[PDB]
Amino acid sequence: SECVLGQSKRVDFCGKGYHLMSFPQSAPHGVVFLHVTYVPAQEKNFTTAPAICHDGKAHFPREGVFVSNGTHWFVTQRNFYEPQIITTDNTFVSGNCDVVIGIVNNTVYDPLQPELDS
């Protein structure tokens, strides 16, 4: 019910890794499930910060985490490396900078500013 007819958030309930689906197979006096799962692979280190200090305001990721390739900071989804530029669209603001431990200075690009000049 919870894996053939649906997708399960229960960890390792239907196969190791993140559960995608399962396929039932008849067996004598039993049943066999083929648990299809998403297993991450080929990870690499990154430096991270919980939030980014723009001019007096702390920006947090809406979805994903902040990472850097050594010099430039990117926001990427947590379980697959897809870096993107920090913008006001994929981050949200809450409070000033000094309250958060591990805050890092970096510019957050407002997409409206380069779009609007007339």
Partner: protein, 49 residues
């Protein structure tokens, strides 16, 4: 050190503050709710232990 990840596959390190931040995000409480009062959360956990 890695939270939920070593169950799914290879253990991926992450700072514990960010891990507990997402776990806050998992229960419908935004990350800034944790980061803005991390010290109180840590003190409460230590007192409970």
């Amino acid at each position: 050190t890695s939270g939920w990840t070593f169950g799914a596959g290879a253990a991926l390190q992450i700072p514990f503050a960010m891990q507990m931040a997402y776990r806050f995000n998992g229960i419908g409480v935004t990350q800034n709710v944790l980061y803005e009062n991390q010290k109180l959360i840590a003190n409460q956990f230590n007192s409970a232990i």
